[model samples]
Target: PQLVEKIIFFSDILAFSTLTEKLPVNEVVILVNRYFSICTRIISAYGGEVTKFIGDCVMASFTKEQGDAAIRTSLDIISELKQLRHHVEATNPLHLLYTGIGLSYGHVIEGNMGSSLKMDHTLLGDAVNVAARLEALTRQLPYALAFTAGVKKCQAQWTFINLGAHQEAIEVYTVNEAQKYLQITQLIRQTL
Candidate 1:
């Protein structure tokens, strides 16, 4: 049997890999806690379920929530991550946090993966790979977030710019534009 569904998957990762790569084992563990704690909050708030952690990155999918919620949640993550960045900056500028988020939509095989000893739940498909690719693509583009065109209908009110084609998937970047009105923000906030 196969557990597969068409859904939108989100992926997010921090910048400064070499710097992150240099963290001590203890710090690595600590940061993963920090990253996931922050990410899962906003993800869960908008109804995206975190399926697994890829090192410090987060991967999540929406079931009942669908595309709008996923993109909305991704936008909120940016705002929250900004605040987290401010907090980290206060403690140590060298440890400033930066992140990129991406979303892709399609049918994916979803279930517990790996062996009995250490299994992990995850989503697998070209869509998942595209989501990860979009996250990586964010770094090359001037945006904190991006997604493949078909990931969703751009329910997010935040501004987006076309990033052209990547790996046969059209991409759009979510620039660092704060939603100009609290009315829309409030509507989203109330649901979260």
Candidate 2:
């Protein structure tokens, strides 16, 4: 099968395992659903597609043309999620939530990956692997967003810190600063 021209993959939502310990299953489900709804909406607005929702996290992909828009959308969703976390924390002191985002771009196989009755449309490639690894690396860092080197190459306004190699594997970048990258990009392409 031919690979997609471009694949922008991201996975986010942190401290979920710890939070679930304090909240009831019903409450957690409700919260997850609400968060997923907001995320899905933002992604779709940018012409990105939600490949799947894995428990407290989400996986999505955007085409090369839509990659910038997808990043902007992801950032907006994260901002909203941060506010949601504040609201949840304020209401219940025991409920603490945080998120870690990872994005990378490359070619991926996109097709149904399961039986007809239990079908799943997903992307499979190095981009997806790197995105997931970056997401996992969040547990080792204080920052909320981490990106693979692939994404950093395309991002112009953000400052990223090299965290060295991990187990002699992939390189990671911590997003230390994000100015008006998303907003400015949007404004510049408003006529599109």
Best by TM-score: 2
Candidate 2 deviant stretches above 4 angstroms: 87-95, 114-119, 178-192
**Maximum-lDDT candidate:** 2
Instruction: Mark the 10 consecutive residues where model 1 has the least summed lDDT.
Output: 178-187
Please give the lDDT score for candidate 2. Answer: 0.64
Model 1: per-residue Cα lDDT over 1-192, one tens digit each: 255654455554544454354546676566567667878988888777787676677878876337677777777766776776566644342244556777776667877789878987666777777777877776666666677656545545545566566775465545455221113223223322
Clashes of each: 0, 0
- Residue 107's lDDT in candidate 1: 69
lDDT (0 to 1) per candidate:
0.63, 0.64
RMSD of each: 8.8, 9.6
**Candidate 2: tens digits of C-alpha lDDT, residues 6-89:** 655565555565456556778777767777888889888888888777777788877767656655775777677666756653
* Pairs of colliding residues, candidate 1: none
